[PDB]
Amino acid sequence: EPEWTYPRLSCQGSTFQKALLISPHRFGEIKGNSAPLIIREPFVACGPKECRHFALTHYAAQPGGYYNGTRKDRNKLRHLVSVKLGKIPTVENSIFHMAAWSGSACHDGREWTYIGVDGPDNDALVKIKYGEAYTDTYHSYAHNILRTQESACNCIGGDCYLMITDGSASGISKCRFLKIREGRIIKEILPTGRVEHTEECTCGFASNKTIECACRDNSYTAKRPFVKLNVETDTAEIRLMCTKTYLDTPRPDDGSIAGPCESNGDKWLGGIKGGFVHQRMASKIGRWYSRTMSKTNRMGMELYVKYDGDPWTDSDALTLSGVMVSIEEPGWYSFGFEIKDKKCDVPCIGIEMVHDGGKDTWHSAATAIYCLMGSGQLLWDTVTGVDMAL
Amino acid sequence: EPEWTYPRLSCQGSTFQKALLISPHRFGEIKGNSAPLIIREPFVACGPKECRHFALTHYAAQPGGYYNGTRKDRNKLRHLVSVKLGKIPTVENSIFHMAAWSGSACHDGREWTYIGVDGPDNDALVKIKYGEAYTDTYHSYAHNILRTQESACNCIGGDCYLMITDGSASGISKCRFLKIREGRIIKEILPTGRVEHTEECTCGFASNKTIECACRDNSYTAKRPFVKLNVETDTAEIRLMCTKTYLDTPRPDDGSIAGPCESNGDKWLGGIKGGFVHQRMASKIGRWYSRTMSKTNRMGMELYVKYDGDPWTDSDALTLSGVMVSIEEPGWYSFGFEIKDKKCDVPCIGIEMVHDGGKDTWHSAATAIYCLMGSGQLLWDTVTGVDMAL
Amino acid sequence: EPEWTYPRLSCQGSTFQKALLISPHRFGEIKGNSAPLIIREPFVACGPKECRHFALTHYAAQPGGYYNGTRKDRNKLRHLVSVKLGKIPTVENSIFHMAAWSGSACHDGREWTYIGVDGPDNDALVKIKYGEAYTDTYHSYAHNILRTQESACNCIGGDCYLMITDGSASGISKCRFLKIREGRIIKEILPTGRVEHTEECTCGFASNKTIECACRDNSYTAKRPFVKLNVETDTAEIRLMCTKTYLDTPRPDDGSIAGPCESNGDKWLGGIKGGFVHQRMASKIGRWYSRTMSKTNRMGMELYVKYDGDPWTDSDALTLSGVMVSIEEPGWYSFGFEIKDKKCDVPCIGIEMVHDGGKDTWHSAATAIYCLMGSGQLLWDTVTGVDMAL
Amino acid sequence: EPEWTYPRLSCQGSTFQKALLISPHRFGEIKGNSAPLIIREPFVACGPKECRHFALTHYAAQPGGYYNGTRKDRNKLRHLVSVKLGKIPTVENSIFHMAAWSGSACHDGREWTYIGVDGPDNDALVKIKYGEAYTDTYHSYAHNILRTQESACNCIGGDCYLMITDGSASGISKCRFLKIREGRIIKEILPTGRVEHTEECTCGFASNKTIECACRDNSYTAKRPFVKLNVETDTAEIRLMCTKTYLDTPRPDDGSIAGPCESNGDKWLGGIKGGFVHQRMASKIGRWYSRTMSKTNRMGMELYVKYDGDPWTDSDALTLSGVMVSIEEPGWYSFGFEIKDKKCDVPCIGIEMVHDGGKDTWHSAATAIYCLMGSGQLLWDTVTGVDMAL
Ligand SMILES: CC(=O)Nc1ccc(C(=O)O)cc1NC(N)N
Ligand SMILES: CC(=O)Nc1ccc(C(=O)O)cc1NC(N)N
Ligand SMILES: CC(=O)Nc1ccc(C(=O)O)cc1NC(N)N
Ligand SMILES: CC(=O)Nc1ccc(C(=O)O)cc1NC(N)N
Ligand SMILES: *[C@@H]1O[C@H](CO)[C@@H](O)[C@H](O)[C@H]1NC(C)=O
Ligand SMILES: *[C@@H]1O[C@H](CO)[C@@H](O)[C@H](O)[C@H]1NC(C)=O
Ligand SMILES: *[C@@H]1O[C@H](CO)[C@@H](O)[C@H](O)[C@H]1NC(C)=O
Ligand SMILES: *[C@@H]1O[C@H](CO)[C@@H](O)[C@H](O)[C@H]1NC(C)=O
Ligand SMILES: [Ca+2]
Ligand SMILES: [Ca+2]
Numbered sequence A, B, C, D: 001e002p003e004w005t006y007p008r009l010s011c012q013g014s015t016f017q018k019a020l021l022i023s024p025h026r027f028g029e030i031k032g033n034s035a036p037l038i039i040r041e042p043f044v045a046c047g048p049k050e051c052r053h054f055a056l057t058h059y060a061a062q063p064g065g066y067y068n069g070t071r072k073d074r075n076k077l078r079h080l081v082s083v084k085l086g087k088i089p090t091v092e093n094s095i096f097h098m099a100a101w102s103g104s105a106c107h108d109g110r111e112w113t114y115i116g117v118d119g120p121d122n123d124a125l126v127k128i129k130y131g132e133a134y135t136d137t138y139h140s141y142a143h144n145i146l147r148t149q150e151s152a153c154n155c156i157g158g159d160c161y162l163m164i165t166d167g168s169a170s171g172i173s174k175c176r177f178l179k180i181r182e183g184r185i186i187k188e189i190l191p192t193g194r195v196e197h198t199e200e201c202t203c204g205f206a207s208n209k210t211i212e213c214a215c216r217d218n219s220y221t222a223k224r225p226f227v228k229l230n231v232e233t234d235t236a237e238i239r240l241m242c243t244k245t246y247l248d249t250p251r252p253d254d255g256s257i258a259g260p261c262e263s264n265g266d267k268w269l270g271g272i273k274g275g276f277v278h279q280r281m282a283s284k285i286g287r288w289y290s291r292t293m294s295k296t297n298r299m300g301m302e303l304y305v306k307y308d309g310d311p312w313t314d315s316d317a318l319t320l321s322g323v324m325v326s327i328e329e330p331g332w333y334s335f336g337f338e339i340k341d342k343k344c345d346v347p348c349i350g351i352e353m354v355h356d357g358g359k360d361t362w363h364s365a366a367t368a369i370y371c372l373m374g375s376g377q378l379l380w381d382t383v384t385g386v387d388m389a390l
């Protein structure tokens, strides 16, 4: 049979370059003959043989007649869908995996693990599916909108880890991690440390011994909760990133939250999922992060890097590495994933570029993708090309 | 070569949860650019590597111009179609298997057996197809609308069983079972017991020794004929379920048919196919059934359970386990199937949710699917989302 | 590697039954959202693992804007296309094999051999393609519309035979057979006997030693030239079928051509391709043929059978076996093919049912398919369901 | 694992014949229900098991609403797309490989190498992708529109070569070759000889020891730079073809550039990519080339041949072999590729036939394909069939 997947060293490179864009709505004109699915929270996850593009469709297409509701996040119609990376996510092209208004997915080397969450707000449920079969579920512990990553889970030697979180969007949401194995949950991991609010974690393997995440704190701070999970002892701790280059939105001027690394600063009520990914080298660790270009709105998107250091205690601003999206273009949830190449892993960052033209029309997303390629500086940005009045 | 499929123990779980919905007509607006096939009597059947979604299309799509006739059940255009479970059943996406206005299908571990029925009413024919080849047929014994399950046939060690029935919808219809093997019929099984009317059987393996079914009796009773087929001796007997929780539609108040289990009660002319499925445990048997929420109309749908007991003689009402569809939504034929997971079977229930807006427009169905997942109570219901005036 | 295909004994059965219909234009309304390709001369050919549906598209779809010319047979746009048997032949679904306005195809057990003919009328060319590669060609010997079978070629032990014909539609057209092998022609076979006009041969294996065909004679007779090709010595002879049940169209009353079997009778200028297929049994040969129901027009279609006998010398009318299409429905070119089942061959007959509504609109075809299944009599006919004004 | 691909001897044949046409816009009427992608610079590349059709889409379909810009060559929306040879390149059918406004691709026997170029004009970048992973990049050396072949790269024993060029379209553009291996560049090859302007090289293997190309010189001459690359020593030299049959466009009367082979003649500002391909025989080399029929405009297309000889020093006009496209039809970029057959290579020529109706509407291309087949003379030409006002 095949073998279990493990993280290898990253492929050599030093900069990130535009790689692909998936703009389904370039094909959704009334005069056109297509039907791209209406989606949001897209993410990409790969296996040894291929990468797939996931999303949560609102079960409607463009052009269509079910646009009311597309702008909201939860309902009985939402489904986690997927197409192979490179295909346009359309009605026929897409494969519906399960009903869900929050989700994750990851390949363990053998089959795919799809995660989905749905049910009432006051009592939602995390559904786990192994390939073709529905394998397990997990209930609401804090009874306020159980939810998940919205990016890929990470599997090592057959065990996949996954952050889940229950709680108020504007208050307390203590997250927990799940060690799933072959569809079945085999251990819950209660994180230690600064746990008042951690949601939408973007996780990855810094090594075979540790998974790390840059998450969202939706109520108390503009800084980002940074999880470090020890896979050896299935223990996890959280502390705020110390860097002055605050990675959340909305947020204030860099390095303006006075105090120790642990200082929240003003609430800056709100947040956004942020891409983060590791570039493991033999004797160094490259950590890459994205941030919107606007301090206040979800416009534009920049890439940062900081080799080595403890995110928990280093105040130093991250190194700017390029503008993937400009302030004139939409920059929403961003995430990281890794393409598996013959001998090494290629770290990447996908950016959900949302089309939003009010709540009186359709609402959907495009997916831009930057990956580590050779050297130099990042050279070009991404535009969607989509005109919403077509 | 591959091996023959057998029933294993069910995967551990205790409750059923919403898993997936397939609502093709969410994409059939005049302003949209899709073409979901117009169908009815959908069912799902799986193999070791995948599940497929079957149905009987009226050979027309939405939007289209051949809506007259869609509301009727038999004609020279109807075809048994299929897509992989998760794909939207559209003109291009679908694969046409054979001409048929009644059907079944099941995978034996090696290839697929598709069943289809067509021909004149007074002399229809059961056509059997092994994979790509047309292998055998079976004629009308009672010369009044020969018909079949409308859900999956069950194969064990290479032999597939299938209930067929000939007779008046409003009178006598004695069913027979067929032991097919590799496309060819190798034995007819004449059932013993209460055989005055048994149609649309929903069958499954309670064990390696016995197949069991909950069928429809269209003329004499609101109770359901319950078939028990001994695979060792290819013998089958039928008796009415004794439970007070009558599973058919239309039907009267529970436990109001006075008399022994064998008492029909008032005719309650009409019926409906009902989902039923087994949850085999090492030392126990879990039997699950669906019933519409309305006593009189095909609106809503509830899940029931009763571990162990003889359905033939136990008066006890079944245990309610959840509302999969509410009385505001359509609840028509329901069925059960089992997903094959690496080491166990995952029992499930699909519900055909029909869009019916008169006989002066299109008529088609959506497919909701609940499967056994973890614990707790069933949490959420299914809606179709479809507006028929689009 | 795989092995070479050979003819085996037919699967046991005694009658033919409706199996499938492919009516693409049921989905070509202006209000619909599909694009079935506009085609003609469809045929079906199988391999050990699957059957494919071939045709010659006019490189335009319905609804579309290139209907002028669809009614004619030859031009620089026509292409031989194919979809797997069961899929609707649409723009995206179809695979374009080569440019051709006449064609054939057959699987040798290993790869597919596609044949196509195109070029000027006074000097056309037979193009042979082995799988993905263009392998050989063959030129016009009589310089008047080189053309081919329009149904499957037959391969035995790696050698495929194929009838080609050059000459006037209203005069002399001596056909020749080609023994192709792995894409390359390795021998021409000049037929002996009654060679004044033989076109559109429908061929098959009566055994491992002989291929036989029922062809069209377009100028001199209503009877059908019957080719017998000895695969041992690659020699072929032709004589007219002696039967009174004349199988061509137009034609006069059965048994009314007075004289020996070799008597042509009145010209009955015109012809039509006719389905023919073998049902080889251990000690008997079943030969099946189709004929339109109307003596003069291409309306309706009937099945005939005659076990054993020499088609060359038996005057006996064939045995009627059923009406596959009624006189109210279109019955054009018909053909025979054989599905390969695990241990035997299943003979079949496809009927091209043409939609013709003048030369001032689209012109295309549907494909009905009857195969040998069990016993009894053929029970039901085929209708297209297509309304041309939609 | 599989083996590395090498060039074998060509399949025997002597002439070229029309093989296939891909005219997506035959299906892009407003009244039709399709969506062929709007593209340009199409090319075809094969592997041991299949050929794929590549192109640079303008990320818009017909009919659609994003036609402005389609006529230009560079922007942030352009993507290198592909479908299997024979499929119509449509939104759903196509697979998007990467963002790029110039590209190449080739199969090494194991996986596919896709090449793409994008970024600012004054500093573009060559992106290399190995199968699913982004593997390497290469920067602008002359800072003026880095660009690539626009036809297939050639791989031998695991090493793929690829011409890249940087410089002014109307001045100096010295090209370089890249020896890529498994996604990673492992050597740059600076060509010796007449290097003032060489772009859009159409390359192939004349043998295992040498790759050869017919390229474009956009500013100085109507003659074509002819590259000869020694794979043994990874060295390359360039000189102008000496033949009087000038293969570029615009160009003057044949044999009218007076002087040695090295004489440029008048600038004839402009150029066009031209198909070229080798027909390697045991003891001879057949070189085939295409040229537009019009000396000044990109209308029509003719095939030429010249067995043996040094293109660098032979003045002899090439031998005309046929008109693939007439002067009434569009003849733009042409290229050569080779289908891999069981035991030999089948050389071919694809012709990009562009639909151009001003800059106030859509702009796209069709792909005609001639391959070496049997003997005789080329018999028939290609038309597109497309009416731009539909
Ligand atoms: C489950 C859910 O509501 N997912 C979301 C999706 C989008 C957005 C969003 O920020 O647009 C927010 C949420 N919720 C949280 N808590 N971030
Ligand atoms: C063959 C056939 O008529 N199938 C049906 C389909 C639907 C329905 C139905 O209840 O909607 C009924 C039938 N017939 C029976 N006897 N139940
Ligand atoms: C090559 C070609 O013309 N094929 C045809 C197709 C249809 C028809 C037809 O009968 O409709 C006729 C022909 N020609 C001949 N000779 N039968
Ligand atoms: C990169 C780029 O501009 N590619 C082109 C495409 C088409 C055309 C063309 O000739 O239509 C020209 C170019 N550029 C050059 N230098 N030939
Ligand atoms: C983890 O272990 C496997 C080899 O056992 C391999 O993926 C890799 O060397 C290790 N991970 C890293 C980042 O080195
Ligand atoms: C039936 O037999 C096979 C093993 O021979 C296996 O599927 C299973 O153990 C048996 N079925 C059940 C329900 O135990
Ligand atoms: C032809 O030969 C092979 C076995 O060698 C097999 O297909 C079959 O027995 C023979 N054909 C017939 C019709 O018997
Ligand atoms: C190149 O080498 C391989 C055999 O090693 C084979 O492709 C061929 O014989 C050689 N190429 C040519 C053109 O002969
Ligand atoms: Ca925050
Ligand atoms: Ca489609």
Ligand SMILES: [Ca+2]
Pocket (backbone or CB within 6 Å): B216, B217, B218, B219, B220, B221, B222, B223, B248, B249, B267, B268, B269, B270, B271, B272
């Ligand atoms: Ca009843």
Ligand SMILES: [Ca+2]
Pocket (backbone or CB within 6 Å): C216, C217, C218, C219, C220, C221, C222, C223, C248, C249, C267, C268, C269, C270, C271, C272
């Ligand atoms: Ca005739």
Ligand SMILES: [Ca+2]
Pocket (backbone or CB within 6 Å): D216, D217, D218, D219, D220, D221, D222, D223, D248, D249, D267, D268, D269, D270, D271, D272
């Ligand atoms: Ca030039």
